Amino acid sequence: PLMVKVLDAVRGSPAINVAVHVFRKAWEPFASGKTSESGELHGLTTEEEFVEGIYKVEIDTKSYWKALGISPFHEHAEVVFTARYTIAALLSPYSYSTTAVVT
Amino acid sequence: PLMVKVLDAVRGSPAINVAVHVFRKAWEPFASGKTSESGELHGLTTEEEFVEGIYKVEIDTKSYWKALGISPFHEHAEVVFTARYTIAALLSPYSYSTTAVVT
Amino acid sequence: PLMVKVLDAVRGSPAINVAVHVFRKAADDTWEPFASGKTSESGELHGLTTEEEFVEGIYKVEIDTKSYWKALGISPFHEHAEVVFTANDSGPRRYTIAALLSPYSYSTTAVVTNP
Amino acid sequence: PLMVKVLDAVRGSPAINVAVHVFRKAADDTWEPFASGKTSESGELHGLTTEEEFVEGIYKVEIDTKSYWKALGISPFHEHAEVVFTANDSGPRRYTIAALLSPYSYSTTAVVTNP
Numbered sequence: 001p002l003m004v005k006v007l008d009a010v011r012g013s014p015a016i017n018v019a020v021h022v023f024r025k026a027w028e029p030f031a032s033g034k035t036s037e038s039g040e041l042h043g044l045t046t047e048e049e050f051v052e053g054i055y056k057v058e059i060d061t062k063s064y065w066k067a068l069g070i071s072p073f074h075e076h077a078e079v080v081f082t083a084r085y086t087i088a089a090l091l092s093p094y095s096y097s098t099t100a101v102v103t
Numbered sequence: 104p105l106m107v108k109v110l111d112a113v114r115g116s117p118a119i120n121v122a123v124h125v126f127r128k129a130w131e132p133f134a135s136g137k138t139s140e141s142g143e144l145h146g147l148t149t150e151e152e153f154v155e156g157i158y159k160v161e162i163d164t165k166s167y168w169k170a171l172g173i174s175p176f177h178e179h180a181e182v183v184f185t186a187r188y189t190i191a192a193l194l195s196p197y198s199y200s201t202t203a204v205v206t
Numbered sequence: 207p208l209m210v211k212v213l214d215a216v217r218g219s220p221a222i223n224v225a226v227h228v229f230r231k232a233a234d235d236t237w238e239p240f241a242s243g244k245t246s247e248s249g250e251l252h253g254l255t256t257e258e259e260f261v262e263g264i265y266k267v268e269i270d271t272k273s274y275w276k277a278l279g280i281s282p283f284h285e286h287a288e289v290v291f292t293a294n295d296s297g298p299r300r301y302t303i304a305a306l307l308s309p310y311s312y313s314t315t316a317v318v319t320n321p
Numbered sequence: 322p323l324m325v326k327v328l329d330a331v332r333g334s335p336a337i338n339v340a341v342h343v344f345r346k347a348a349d350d351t352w353e354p355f356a357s358g359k360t361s362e363s364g365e366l367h368g369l370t371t372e373e374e375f376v377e378g379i380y381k382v383e384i385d386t387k388s389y390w391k392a393l394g395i396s397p398f399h400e401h402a403e404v405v406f407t408a409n410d411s412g413p414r415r416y417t418i419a420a421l422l423s424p425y426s427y428s429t430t431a432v433v434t435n436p
């Protein structure tokens with residue numbers, strides 16, 4: 001029901017091994033994981049657990065850029081939303097964009 | 104070797120049935136098709152045909168928004184690039200962003 | 207030292223009268239209110255802070271996208287933006303935070319200048 | 322009537338001294354040169370055209386991202402942006418075309434005002 005994908009706009013590649021945390025407004029931690037070699041993170045939650053509510057997806061972009069040797073602006077990339085969801089984040093050192101696609 | 108994906112940032116959905124044309128700088132038409140129900144367009148070209156060069160991917164966003172009843176700003180969304188490539192476009196009535204991911 | 211600019215990708219306009227709240231991370235890792243305001247007719251919010259108030263730390267800029275969309279009769283997926291960054295760590299800088307809004311997406315960038 | 326603004330998402334700065342070419346679609350469906358210039362220290366390009374020269378039609382704004390990246394020692398995937406739109410069809414408007422640049426991506430939006 002929820003998938004996160006992270007792309008790197010500087011190197012033109014998936015953003016691999018990026019930590020992603022999901023919170024639900026009571027911020028109860030709700031789910032988390034690290035992106036795969038495809039930049040995707042599957043298996044966050046289950047239908048039973050993902051109820052309507054306000055969620056935040058916080059992507060640890062700072063650790064990502066720091067491991068590449070690039071100084072980043074933001075602490076994170078994110079989307080706070082009211083609730084299949086795909087959340088995608090496109091990363092640059094001084095910018096991000098985040099979208100949701102609900103199918 | 105080349106895939107195009109188109110997303111709609113207003114309705115939060117894949118952009119379905121969108122015409123996509125690819126050109127190669129001699130603009131020789133090179134490939135084209137329409138996005139599927141997933142917003143994706145597979146099968147554009149072949150390894151043998153997709154040689155290094157300058158390519159333009161032009162997405163007919165105007166026809167897309169007009170069929171939805173929304174007045175759009177642009178004639179198209181696009182990326183002109185020097186050359187697996189995935190080109191993704193995120194559409195709004197007055198904006199687009201386009202990225203490439205090369206894996 | 208801190209300017210916020212907000213654009214509307216649905217209407218092709220500045221995002222006018224959008225509420226913007228800035229917070230600073232406190233010692234106890236809570237967010238303490240720092241400064242707030244509304245965008246002007248040009249989409250810009252000037253005068254949030256001063257050089258004397260703008261210390262180093264972790265700042266959060268929250269843009270109230272929900273109210274903006276709702277008031278325009280648009281469905282926001284987006285509750286609010288939360289733009290979070292370390293400021294002034296290596297000395298005073300000027301920051302412009304820009305945000306481009308759509309109902310299911312936003313883009314944000316920073317312009318950092320050394321004054 | 323036509324302004325272009327360009328930002329750099331790699332460096333967190335305006336994109337300065339970027340070449341911008343504007344073309345207008347001719348009757349034979351070729352692109353005819355219309356106006357061109359370079360961005361300033363603020364990333365802005367003012368003075369492209371005048372109200373008397375800016376007629377209705379299909380315009381293409383090409384931003385030379387390749388040269389900008391190369392000169393900064395960055396690999397551009399991006400050869401150039403091609404931002405294409407119908408202007409002035411229902412009467413004269415003022416347009417701001419903004420572009421946010423990264424090596425493998427760009428975002429663009431329009432601000433349209435009725436003067």
Ligand SMILES: O=C(O)c1ccccc1Nc1ccccc1
Pocket residue numbers: 005007088089090097098099108189190191192193200201202203204
């Ligand atoms: O959504 C995807 O599957 C995707 C695949 C390749 C490149 C970008 C992608 N997403 C997207 C593109 C532009 C802005 C924000 C997100």
Ligand SMILES: O=C(O)c1ccccc1Nc1ccccc1
Pocket residue numbers: 211213302303304305306313314315316317326328419420421428429430
């Ligand atoms: O339009 C501006 O004046 C502006 C100023 C500073 C930073 C970004 C800007 N616009 C913009 C923001 C995100 C995506 C595309 C365009």
Ligand SMILES: [Ca+2]
Pocket residue numbers: 052
């Ligand atoms: Ca409900």
Ligand SMILES: [Ca+2]
Pocket residue numbers: 155
């Ligand atoms: Ca070669």
Ligand SMILES: [Ca+2]
Pocket residue numbers: 262294295296297
């Ligand atoms: Ca310090």
Ligand SMILES: [Ca+2]
Pocket residue numbers: 377409410411412
């Ligand atoms: Ca007309």
